[PDB]
């Protein structure tokens, strides 16, 4: 079988693994990471993208069962072990293939989607959208943010705003800047409403 058929099989395996997810969230997430990774790969001029595509599609299915499935794709040990290593370490440095899967995954954590995911989690945990703090806005970008009670907005300062600068590839950095800029815009709009006519 060729690479195309193998990727197709990995795609099928992934959907089957998450078939019992009555939200489709898991599958959608994997698909976005996969599509982001493919966009980055081409942009970074990567000839063979088998490792990247397999890693992206299967990174969330975890290794006995994974090794079993991979054992049916007729892959060499070098490639097989390559994918497993990436999935396992997806802190150590990785090959460009691994750093691209990382970038694709990181990108899904920011932007309109990252914001949406963040608020969903807060709602799931019954956390507030935001809380009043005595810390200055500037201090929120430092470790002092850990002193805040959990809130969706806290997560913007503690994690989301730091992801763009962590992108590895130039293409991922570019995509990240757009989504980063958007999150700032959302925050400013959020605060304008939160403090509307408040004084």
Q: Is 122 in the site for a second copy (CB under 8 A)?
A: yes
Q: What is the dihedral of CA 173, 175, 178, 180, to 10 degrees?
A: -60
Name, in order, each residue with C-beta under 8 angstroms of 54's C-beta and a sequence gap of 6 or more: 6, 7, 10, 70, 73, 83
105 binds Zn ion (CB under 5 A): yes
What are the tokens at 14?
């992934």
Nearest distance, CB of residue 187 and Zn ion, angstroms: 24
Q: Which of 11, 13, 130, 156 binds a second copy (CB under 8 A)?
A: 130
Total interface residues for a second copy by CB under 8 A: 45
Q: Tell me the C-alpha to C-alpha distance, in Å, between residue 79 and each of 12, 44, 121.
A: 20, 20, 36
Stretch that binds Zn ion, among 5-13, 36-44, 53-61, 128-136 (CB under 5 A): 53-61
User: Can you tell me the distance from the alpha carbon of 3 to that of 95, in angstroms, rounded to the nearest whole number?
Assistant: 20
Confirm or reject binding of residue 20 to a second copy (CB under 8 A): no
Give the range of 32-40, 61-69, 79-87, 89-97 binding a second copy by CB under 8 A.
Answer: 32-40
| From Zn ion, a second copy, none, interface partner of 105 (C-beta below 5 to 8 A by class) | Zn ion
């Amino acid at each position: 079988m060729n690479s195309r058929m193998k990727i197709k099989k990995a795609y099928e395996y992934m959907k089957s693994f998450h078939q019992h997810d009555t939200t489709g969230h898991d599958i959608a997430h994997v698909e976005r990471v996969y599509n982001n990774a493919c966009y980055i790969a081409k942009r970074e001029n990567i000839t063979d993208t088998l490792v990247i595509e397999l890693s992206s599609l299967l990174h969330d299915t975890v290794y006995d069962q994974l090794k079993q499935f991979l054992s049916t794709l007729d892959l060499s040990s070098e490639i097989s072990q390559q994918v497993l290593y990436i999935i396992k370490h997806m802190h150590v440095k990785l090959s460009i293939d691994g750093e691209i899967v990382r970038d694709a995954d990181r990108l899904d954590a920011i932007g309109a989607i990252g914001i949406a995911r963040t608020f969903q989690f807060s709602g799931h945990f019954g956390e507030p959208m935001w809380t009043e703090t005595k810390l200055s806005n500037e201090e929120l970008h430092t470790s002092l943010v850990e002193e805040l009670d959990n809130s969706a907005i806290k997560h913007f300062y503690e994690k989301l705003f730091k992801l763009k600068d962590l992108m590895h590839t130039p293409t991922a950095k570019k995509l990240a800047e757009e989504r980063h800029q958007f999150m700032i815009q959302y925050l400013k709009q959020f605060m304008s409403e939160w403090n509307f006519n408040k004084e």
